[PDB]
Amino acid sequence: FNILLATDSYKVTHYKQYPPNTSKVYSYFECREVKYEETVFYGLQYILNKYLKGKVVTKEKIQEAKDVYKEHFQDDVFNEKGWNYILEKYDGHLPIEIKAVPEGFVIPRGNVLFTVENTDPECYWLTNWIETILVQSWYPITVATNSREQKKILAKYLLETSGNLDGLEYKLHDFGYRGVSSQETAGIGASAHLVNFKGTDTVAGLALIKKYYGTKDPVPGYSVPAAEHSTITAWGKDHEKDAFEHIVTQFSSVPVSVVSDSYDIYNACEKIWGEDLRHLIVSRSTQAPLIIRPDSGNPLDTVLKVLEILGKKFPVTENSKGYKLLPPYLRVIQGDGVDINTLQEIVEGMKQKMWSIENIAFGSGGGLLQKLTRDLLNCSFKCSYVVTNGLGINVFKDPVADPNKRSKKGRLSLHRTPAGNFVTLEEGKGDLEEYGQDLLHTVFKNGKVTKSYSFDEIRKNAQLNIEL
Amino acid sequence: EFNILLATDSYKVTHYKQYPPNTSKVYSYFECREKVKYEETVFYGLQYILNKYLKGKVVTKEKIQEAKDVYKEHFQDDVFNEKGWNYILEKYDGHLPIEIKAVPEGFVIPRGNVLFTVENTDPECYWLTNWIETILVQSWYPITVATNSREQKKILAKYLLETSGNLDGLEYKLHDFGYRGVSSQETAGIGASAHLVNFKGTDTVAGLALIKKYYGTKDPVPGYSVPAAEHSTITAWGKDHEKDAFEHIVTQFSSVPVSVVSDSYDIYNACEKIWGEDLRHLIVSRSTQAPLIIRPDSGNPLDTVLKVLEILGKKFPVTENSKGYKLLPPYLRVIQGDGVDINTLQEIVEGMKQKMWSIENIAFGSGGGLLQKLTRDLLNCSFKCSYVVTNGLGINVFKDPVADPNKRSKKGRLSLHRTPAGNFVTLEEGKGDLEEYGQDLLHTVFKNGKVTKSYSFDEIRKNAQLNIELEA
Ligand SMILES: O=C(NCc1ccc2sccc2c1)[C@H]1CCCN(c2ncnc3nn(-c4ccc(C(F)(F)F)cc4)cc23)C1
Ligand SMILES: O=C(NCc1ccc2sccc2c1)[C@H]1CCCN(c2ncnc3nn(-c4ccc(C(F)(F)F)cc4)cc23)C1
Ligand SMILES: [Cl-]
């Protein structure tokens, strides 16, 4: 990986664009103002370690960038001198200071989350060179936020229909491995999901967490055996019962998920699971239930009909809240067409039909990890302060067309209000000490990570109020 | 170091226990299922995955032990198929006994056709075909980026030809701004590579290194860029010094095209008063080869572009081209780089045509729309098992959910053929064996750990050409 080639093309030309005698460039990141009123800050530590720390400049990487940019621009605009200065004076370590709110923190929209500035007047251009790298923080931030908002919905309806939050952490399972754009995205996004839940089929997220964050337990996420359409349909259309019987027998003492919509979902629940193989189901342990998985049709209508079918073939109880409950050896997972919008429609529809959320878990793939954009939380990186000719000026952009696009001014700090909320102070006014100490911590300075967090601390920082 | 044993969906670790006993072959295919309609898809991206993740010695004793340890904790049971993976290590030196056949990269294929097939070449590795489903299915992303980018090229081609009379500079009309708007570094390189199948302009440098490394081009670089300002380089001069920043930047880049974002404070003021009066003398002296490209970054995309053009038309000498459409002087152009996606792009060029503005005046930049706002759902990319051999007898397998007709899968051994009318057809149940449809267009691209056929990025670009381009 070459950091010289890891930025937007036009930033190669920006060192020629600042006012002469600019010694400091200071920029910040924010999620500008389900409304997504607060965001989980997560992901920066991965980027600091993988891409920014240590000796990131070498003579080979300088020559490599020079050659590519010569052709890419059909001209020689690359700042070979500036990158050679960093190589010689700092042994390839970036003269940059980054301050950030602790990872896992839940911060309302419109607050400074991290800031970036150069620690050497010669590398004024370096602050915004690494904008492209740092701005991709939007994705772990957005995945963790949107997953936590789904946890809020599940927590509300689980508590309503069951009376507690038992198993809340396993109610949203990550199916997004094949639905995302790359391997690296799969690991990043799955790790952001594991901030809030414990269930994932995306194995790459586990290795990311151990390498860059760490956890007391051996792994941060868990899975169960499960069938796919290929392992069912390979038996032939007339032998779906044989496949079902073989699979739950092979996994008789662990939980097993079995997709049951290969040909007819309703038929499989009523006659195969509910009549032919019913004796293999009711014999199952509470620890290892059969989890029927519908994979097609309208998500809410399918779940309700599936439950109504199973309720008439199996012994239903009424829990202490008055809500119906399958026997402990039988559960349901809906892992098709689940995003935050449809998830809300399902649990509300289940509650209206007096079904407890204990009966169901959810799986999400593309919605959980792929259908998200930087626009969703307005993740933005803008320069707020420069020093030219020895006097610093507060800088901002205020487009006439859009008020929302307006940016913060000057040196920034994050503080607690007297009522315990968050406030971002502008124009260096945090130096007046009317709001206490600045919340941001130096996490990166001059090529070294100076403060880090375990994935256990991040999980505790990210918990819901209902859980506290 | 990447471990292929840890690069699949968790539950596929347990699937070797789930197939019918005495199964010697598992045969699966990839397609963009039938449901801007997206009637045809550019096949691109598989060669990247074959080389980066699948070829060579991908199994080692350390990687087997590593997977065993993680899996035991992950499932809280021992389900990992250590025996099957050690067989591949000892018998084939860690090379995957798999054969992959595929339509050539760059080919434009209508929806509902087999694009590649996967099968095991050793009866002991029946489970391996679908183990690598997750790795292979991620080809949906370069396929979808290339298809959606080509569809935007179609729109630009139609309106450029209508308002100008030719397609000059079409391959530069959609610029890739998506580096910071995507989910990771690897995604940025893959997606920018798929955009360069259809265009030449990119700010995502990672796509260039991917192409050189995995595909290659006769030319030194696949994509090109121009110097450009951002809000940070303008606003750093101060509120009252936007004119100073403008003047400094166009003078530093007197000799090449330079894009200057002009909406930091007031976009309309910048074009009418600053570009159009204060600095007009630095603009009109510019060469045709190195024009000033004014960039508006906010407000309604169509309304801003129209008002910007109306402002510039009154401060600068406009001509009427041979089609009757208005044209800025060659030293002055416009680029709209905000809020551009396939739907918005169509709205802009149509609105420009209604106001008698040539598409020659404008280029477009897209970030999130071009590379991040796409899903596997859009082209219905799907990987399914269509054929298996059990007890020596091959059977055609498929899924036919009652709730959804669209979810139904193809049956048996598959082949892709040219029809008598020149269209494409996918033959099911091994019927391609009959030879009534000509030669199978799928070629073996991967067999037993080796990439057996590869394509240059030059061939891919030729294969993906628009019909309008061919006639011209
Ligand atoms: O009772 C436990 N287990 C068995 C169990 C109970 C309820 C349900 S509801 C769907 C599955 C399931 C399974 C203990 C032991 C630990 C789990 N516990 C859980 N409590 C509440 N809801 C849970 N959902 N899942 C779950 C979700 C998705 C998947 C899959 F297939 F996608 F990977 C697998 C399991 C676990 C839940 C506590
Ligand atoms: O002298 C050439 N062009 C100058 C030119 C003409 C029209 C326009 S309209 C926007 C820019 C522009 C620039 C030759 C040489 C090669 C280019 N030619 C092109 N012909 C037609 N449309 C083109 N758009 N772009 C373009 C788009 C985006 C960006 C960026 F990076 F800022 F985003 C830069 C340039 C080039 C066009 C032919
Ligand atoms: Cl999905």
PDB file of N, CA, C and O and ligand atoms in Angstrom, chain A residues 175 365-366, chain B residues 376, ligand 3:
ATOM      1  N   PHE A 175     -25.739 -11.108   7.643  1.00  0.00           N
ATOM      2  CA  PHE A 175     -25.684 -11.975   6.472  1.00  0.00           C
ATOM      3  C   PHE A 175     -25.017 -11.295   5.278  1.00  0.00           C
ATOM      4  O   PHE A 175     -25.139 -11.779   4.149  1.00  0.00           O
ATOM      5  N   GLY A 365     -28.542  -8.546   5.156  1.00  0.00           N
ATOM      6  CA  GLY A 365     -27.316  -8.584   4.386  1.00  0.00           C
ATOM      7  C   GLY A 365     -26.961  -7.244   3.780  1.00  0.00           C
ATOM      8  O   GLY A 365     -26.204  -6.474   4.357  1.00  0.00           O
ATOM      9  N   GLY A 366     -27.543  -6.959   2.623  1.00  0.00           N
ATOM     10  CA  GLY A 366     -27.303  -5.714   1.923  1.00  0.00           C
ATOM     11  C   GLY A 366     -27.760  -4.496   2.702  1.00  0.00           C
ATOM     12  O   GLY A 366     -27.104  -3.465   2.691  1.00  0.00           O
TER      13      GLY A 366
ATOM     14  N   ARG B 376     -26.602  -5.601  -4.653  1.00  0.00           N
ATOM     15  CA  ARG B 376     -26.786  -6.837  -5.401  1.00  0.00           C
ATOM     16  C   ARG B 376     -28.214  -6.990  -5.901  1.00  0.00           C
ATOM     17  O   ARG B 376     -28.451  -7.740  -6.854  1.00  0.00           O
TER      18      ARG B 376
HETATM   19 CL    CL C   3     -29.125  -9.759   0.903  1.00  0.00          CL
END
